[PDB]
Design a protein around this ligand. Sequence first.
Ligand code: BCR
Ligand code: A1H1M
Ligand code: A1H1M
Lengths: 244, 49, 154, 498, 144, 403
Amino acid sequence: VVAFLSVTSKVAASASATRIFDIPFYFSSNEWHLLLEILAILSMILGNLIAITQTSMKRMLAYSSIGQIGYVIIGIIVGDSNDGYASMITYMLFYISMNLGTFACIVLFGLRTGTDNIRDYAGLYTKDPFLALSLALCLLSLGGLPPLAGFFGKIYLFWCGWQAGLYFLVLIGLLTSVLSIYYYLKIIKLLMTGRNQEITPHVRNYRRSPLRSKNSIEFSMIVCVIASTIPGISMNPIITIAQD
Amino acid sequence: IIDGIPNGFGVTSFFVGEGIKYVGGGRISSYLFWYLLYVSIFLFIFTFT
Amino acid sequence: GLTDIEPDLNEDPRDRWATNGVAPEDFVYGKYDEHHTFYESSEKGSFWGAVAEEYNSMDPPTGFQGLISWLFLPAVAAGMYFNVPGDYLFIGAGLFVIIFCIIEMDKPDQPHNFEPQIYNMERGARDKLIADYNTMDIWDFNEKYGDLWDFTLK
Amino acid sequence: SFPWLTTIVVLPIFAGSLIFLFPHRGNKVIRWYTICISMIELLLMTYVFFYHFQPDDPLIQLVEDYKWINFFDFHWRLGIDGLSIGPILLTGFITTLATLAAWPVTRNSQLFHFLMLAMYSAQIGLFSSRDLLLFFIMWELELIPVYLLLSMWGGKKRLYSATKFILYTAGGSIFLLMGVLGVGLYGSNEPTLNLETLVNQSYPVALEIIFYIGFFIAFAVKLPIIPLHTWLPDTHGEAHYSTCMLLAGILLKMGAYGLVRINMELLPHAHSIFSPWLMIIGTMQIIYAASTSPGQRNLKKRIAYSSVSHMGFIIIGISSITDTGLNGAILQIISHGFIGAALFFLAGTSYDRIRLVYLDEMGGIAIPMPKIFTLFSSFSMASLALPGMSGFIAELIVFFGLITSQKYLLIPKLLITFGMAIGMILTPIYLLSMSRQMFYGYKLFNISNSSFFDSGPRELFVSTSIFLPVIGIGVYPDLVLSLSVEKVEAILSNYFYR
Amino acid sequence: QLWLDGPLPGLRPAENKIGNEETGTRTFLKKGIYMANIGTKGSALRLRKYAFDLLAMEDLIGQDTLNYVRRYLRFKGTFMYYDFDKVISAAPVADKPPLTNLANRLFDNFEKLQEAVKLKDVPLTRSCYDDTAVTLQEVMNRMA
Amino acid sequence: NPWLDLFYDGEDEPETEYGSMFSDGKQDEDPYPRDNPENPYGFLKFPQGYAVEMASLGSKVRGDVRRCCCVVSGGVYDNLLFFPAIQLIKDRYPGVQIDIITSARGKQTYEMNKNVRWATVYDLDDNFPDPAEYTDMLGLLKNRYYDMVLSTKLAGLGHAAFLFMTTARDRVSYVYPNVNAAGAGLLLSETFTPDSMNLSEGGYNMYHQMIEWLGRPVKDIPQHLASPLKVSISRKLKEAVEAKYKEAGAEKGKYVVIHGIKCDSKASMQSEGDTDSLLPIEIWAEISQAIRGVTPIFVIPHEKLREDVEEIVGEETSIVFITTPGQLAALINDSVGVIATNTAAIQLALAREKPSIALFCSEEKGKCFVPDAEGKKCTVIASKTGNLADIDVAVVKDTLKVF
Ligand SMILES: CC1=C(/C=C/C(C)=C/C=C/C(C)=C/C=C\C=C(C)\C=C\C=C(C)\C=C\C2=C(C)CCCC2(C)C)C(C)(C)CCC1
Ligand SMILES: CCC[C@H]1CC[C@H]([C@H]2CC[C@@H](O[C@@H]3O[C@H](CO)[C@@H](O[C@H]4O[C@H](CO)[C@@H](O)[C@H](O)[C@H]4O)[C@H](O)[C@H]3O)CC2)CC1
Ligand SMILES: CCC[C@H]1CC[C@H]([C@H]2CC[C@@H](O[C@@H]3O[C@H](CO)[C@@H](O[C@H]4O[C@H](CO)[C@@H](O)[C@H](O)[C@H]4O)[C@H](O)[C@H]3O)CC2)CC1
């Protein structure tokens, strides 16, 4: 349910915000532009700073979501002229796969393990290399790491911001993206601990079991997307600049 | 001195993050009060001044 | 190194820039420095015997692998001297590399090729592991001794 | 017609993606497959350099242009010239030898060799990229492999070193991205990122200066420039020596390559403005690192600070606006890629036996380990700018480029020429002392250290195969300079009156 | 003053009319070469020495090493061009026309040699270099 | 204080239940989540209704700790006296892993501890540390994910901030009694004010406030007390010290351990609350002349003192070089008696139940450091003038027949 409210709530609210700030409120653009600029700068600054001091995975993903929403807000701020709404989508489409994969891995890990603390994610690579690989790929896509969807999504979001002259917003986005590597790397640093003394008994008694399960298919439809959409970021925008 | 700047950046980032995390309280009444103070501030900024 | 017992901490400081050898007053000159420690002997072996022993101690490739590894460089030098096309040289070098690597993959595995957990098990169990890994297929080995590579199990 | 450069870039990462299909245990099959891929790729670059690269051509060669994203006008564009083929060959050589020297690695060998092949592909893609955003992507594509290599095969403080490295590189590379956005959006009609059409662009002085600063912050984070060098000592000291080859021989030269390709070529006016201030910075960097090196008790930290010191000659040759200075900078790039990698390799192999860190407790290693002593002394002599080695001729050509420079008049030309000279007084002072604290003196060693303790055939071959080009270039420097005498001249052709 | 501010100065035009008639400059000249200021005597000594250096270029002429011939020709040609300008500018007024004629013939030979090198024609390079050789021998005989 | 925690609404009502699962008991009693071998996908067996992630519930509801970080200041003596606190943490919180941060000398104390997972060396006395080392230690503490951190070091603002950035749920520390510790309690979950600027001035019960806070009765859990000091000696230490005293000529169960020879060595294992705990070698020779039938072994912390002893008590005596506290405890274990000045030797004798004689500079220090000497087979011979060199050798000679 929290994964649903992470991906479904932001899409509908983004659509409502775009259709309520452009159609009935275009005459007062100089006010809600400032409101959205404050709302985005504070969001990235106070969603990426608190996420690096988190001991729970779901809460860290919460601060992650309230950080990544500020990148999408730039698409509303720039407007429909310098792409803009075409950069809201082609990043929200990315964000859906990123968050649903990084929540599917959490779902499987919690179901087979029974925990939510980040400290119990140590040594998952030794037990389930596939799950650790998929979670690491989802988190690195979340951090905007190069060969994964978040990096191209962020450079698409920042190209329109620079084209519209919003140097402050793009600079804050890049600085907060730098801050947004320490987490999405802390979990991987835990995942690659071979120290048996630091491995929690939660993952010591971990049974992967010889069955596929439904979530594996659902996130195999996702992990192969956040990595292999990186060439297909020319097919998506021509469906998103066509709208106006 | 020279190496104190990046490590100082990291330490100050950690301290500010911890302070912002701990300063709220986690109570619902505090959540509502902080959610409403900034609404009042926005209303005073964009209408009065 | 490694200490099973906590070592005694250094109470007295030492100069960082000083030489770390023994003191010059404790130096046995002529012995610690190899200056009077070589007395000749009628029993000196053959030069080519020493060459062969040193070459064989490195465990050279033998057979076809030894043949190609011996004949690669003179063939390349002759081809470059005789102005033969270089594409043939590149084809030969690539074929030599691929053949050498495939032959080396075909060679049996040794105890030092595995993880320290696999190296430091019971010696008889390790010997049985090495004997099986070079005998049965990799899929049968993985379905039989797979759980030995879950290092968190123990 | 055939996509040679695309195949060269794609082959290592594509082959390493298939390393997870292997169900074998151990490291034998994985390392032999990886060395097969590395040697096949090396032969491919050798064929390209032999048959399709012309050193007399100052233009771009073997170009390939495939439109990938229409919105950014962004193309997968590849091309080589006299500037790039040297770093490309050095990347292939050093990466193959680092794969060969990483053979005792038995813990997570599959991931290790996959990351090595990914690093191969990323470095080659950077050195042969003719698109600004492609350059930025290939620049970014190494943050994760080096982070994983550090955090999983490093030293005692590997995790802090990896975090510091990735955060510092991201902090530089966001300025790199801002510079890319600024340069690629300056077009009045449509955005453009091709370097060929950007080399003729005209900017106002202030905007050119801002773009130069945006690129130079990144190229000073990567190529160590005072005071943006603090990531390097703990990153290189606490890394695996095989990874240290790529870190101190290849990744350090990428900042210099970006400085020539972007700062020196695309923006000549801002470079002429900034170069006299770069000369003082380079001289003070040489002095500062050559003075920091005696203060380091750790051996690898001393070698890392020596690398920072040696980068100052590259900075000087960049800032001295002559063909001779740029040729000396390229020669020093090649020389340092041949020297620092071997020094780090010898340090790691020696630590694998002695298992000691600080120099004040490693006396008498020359008695059980004489061959590594010989190689360490020879590579220290190469570091010492001794004639017969590439370092001496590189520094001499940099000195000549400063002396023959027309931008500076007399007194600075004196005070800089004296400056680096102080450096080659300070460079012996620690280096030999290092050897004196690492090999000289007598210590009673164990009998088990009498045999099967020295460097084997593999380590001897690696050290010899990196030492031989040093002698070959120190005897005949035009084995390297003749590849880039023409193109450098073209780079200089924009710095004179027209 | 410590350093130059604008772009570096290019090829300074000669004031003795030793350049090409149509262009005013020679093709083999290279910008950015450091010429030491010695004077008329030093320029004459360098002129003779570098004429000998260019007459040492028989071995470099070949099908595989024409680029190095062109590089050495441009380097030494710039050097002797500006040395010839210096020595003509300080020569007595009676001796200026023959020195200018000799310099013009030598630089025309330089252009012909560079043109032959550009087309990668070896017999043409050899013939043009033979004419250049007799002109260089005349130059050292004049300036001994 | 109202301005800090707005909307306090008092404490919890007496009828609040905090749910059913992970509510009462200890950490080892939780029945859920349990293994489900019948599940084809490896999912565990979870209770009806409850969310899958239940391991985080115990920290919020029951206040369970699984990893604890005790940053113990001082040398060998303080880290040794912290052993009952570590045993109290182990008893109160089953299955907990306890990591120790201390100095280089204090790290060797935990060689003979069965409860500590990691012992780490960190220069706590440096008020201006290296930024790289400080950042590395802080990141290490952050990455261990400690549930609770305790600090015996007197914490100012800087130490409180260092504990704050540890991301620990409970941050407990001793603070400075002066005004310089203002604002430190804001960043700490719990604060203790000692009776002096030196925590080691207190004796065996110097950590009594921390012991009381660790064993308080909360939520139908009975109050937990502190066990007497105990140590566990491994076989390697025993063999090493056996070789060490066999080179000195003594044999097993036929020697006594003399400790407290005056020297400038830092391995004397003294306490910061007793700086006078050293006796000159002449008084030690006078005392050891009265030993009959049992070979007196002199423990020297530095080899440079050895020759001095060889020219004070005699060349034909038994001298043993001990620097590591595990080796000292192993020597005391195989002995029959300990004649020690106020060092860690008398505490290890109390741990190994050996009859021993404690020489103190004052009676107050004697009763504070060993409050139960009479019960634990010890006689406290304290100097009547407050100076240890003014002790009378006649009383010690009379008392030395207990062995
Ligand atoms: C740049 C480059 C390169 C190239 C290089 C070259 C070109 C080389 C050459 C070289 C040469 C052409 C050489 C010749 C000759 C040599 C010799 C003749 C030598 C001798 C030696 C000896 C005899 C010995 C030595 C030693 C050792 C080994 C070590 C120790 C010390 C000693 C010194 C003893 C490459 C490809 C790598 C790649 C990358 C880039
Ligand atoms: C300069 C850096 C930025 C900033 C400086 C000031 C920093 C905070 C630190 C701490 C915070 O604490 C305040 O005090 C209260 C205690 O009552 C808390 O309330 C607790 O109450 C319970 C324990 O009493 C806990 O169970 C609750 O989780 C928590 O609510 C309250 O959070 C907070 O108001 C004040 C200053 C932050 C960094
Ligand atoms: C231009 C470089 C100068 C110098 C020229 C001479 C060069 C050596 C090369 C190698 C060696 O050839 C071999 O040496 C020996 C001859 O006497 C015979 O070996 C037997 O005599 C040795 C003499 O003590 C004994 O040690 C051996 O046990 C015994 O087998 C061997 O047949 C012959 O092949 C001499 C010329 C070096 C460079």
